[PDB]
């Protein structure tokens, strides 16, 4: 949903096309910010 705003603004405005390189990565899970969660998802 947060994507759908900024990327939609990118597709809308033609000024951001030559000024910003919008990029994004769908981050997964991190083991820091516990061990039980990591064990459960590694079993998954």
């Amino acid at each position: 949903s947060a994507l759908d705003a900024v990327v939609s603004r990118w597709h809308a405005e033609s000024s951001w096309a030559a000024r910003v390189s919008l990029a994004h990565a769908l981050i997964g899970w991190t083991r820091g910010t516990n061990d039980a969660i990591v064990a459960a998802v590694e079993e998954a």
Partner: protein, 41 residues
């Protein structure tokens, strides 16, 4: 005015008929209008 206003409107309008009559289930319609459809989604 859309999201927070109607969400607190649902909360308030559903609070009143909570303890007075059980299984009185409130109903809401949502106005959803491609990019406009994306914002609606």
């Amino acid at each position: 005015v859309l999201l927070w206003a109607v969400q607190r409107l649902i909360g308030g309008l559903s609070t009143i008929g909570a303890e007075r009559d059980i299984a009185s289930r409130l109903h809401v319609v949502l106005p959803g209008s491609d990019g406009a459809y994306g914002e609606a989604k």
